Amino acid sequence: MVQVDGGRFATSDLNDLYRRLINRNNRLKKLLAQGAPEIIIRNEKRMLQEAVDALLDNGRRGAPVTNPGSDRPLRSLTDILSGKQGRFRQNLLGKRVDYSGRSVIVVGPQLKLHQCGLPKRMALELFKPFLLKKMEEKGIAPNVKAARRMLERQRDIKDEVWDALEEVIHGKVVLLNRAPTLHRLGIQAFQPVLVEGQSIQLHPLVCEAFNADFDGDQMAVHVPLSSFAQAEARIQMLSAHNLLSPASGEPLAKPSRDIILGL
């Protein structure tokens, strides 16, 4: 039960399912002490069952319990666990993550196969903690807390801060993903090349594995944090180290479109 922005309250449906149960239990205790006839106790007891039923799996047996003046079935414990939106397939086998971003992709013919164009403004957020530490070593700010204060306002960013970021990302890779991720190459690792501009630059040869075109596709960026994650990316996931289809064994990164045409 939380207060939202407006001072309004927002509450989980389980509270209403519990309230129904609690009322009926308490009423049952009262009806028993007052020695109600068997017809009345029977109605109360059967109502208690239905209340337990709605709490555990609502709609399973009988009419789904609804909030008043809405057709929406209340969301019971079973609904929380199960389904596409359930606890398992939503919060357990997949999650939203930190250190990630997304933008429109653009072709970057000049890139080497292991590279991508990464907007500098994206990289500053994605690497923000790394940038704060480095900003203290070269002194651009007295300490970590003050350095963060400088990035809050966009006009307060000086030009030495961009050079600071270049030092940070040295040799590190990022992950690019384009959904749907149909096979393991929907994610590949790239060494980012910082660019002005708001677009991600993608190497032409990897477009086939991603099934990416430039008709407006977007891709997601992720930053592997640990030395272990970074190693995994550079060795196992780097685009240049995966050149052949794991399915057929045939070359995946191969000439296409203009490249074939020219040759």
Partner: peptide
């Protein structure tokens, strides 16, 4: 099968 109808 209908709790109201049963009670009635």
């Amino acid at each position: 099968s209908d709790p109201v109808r049963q009670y009635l």
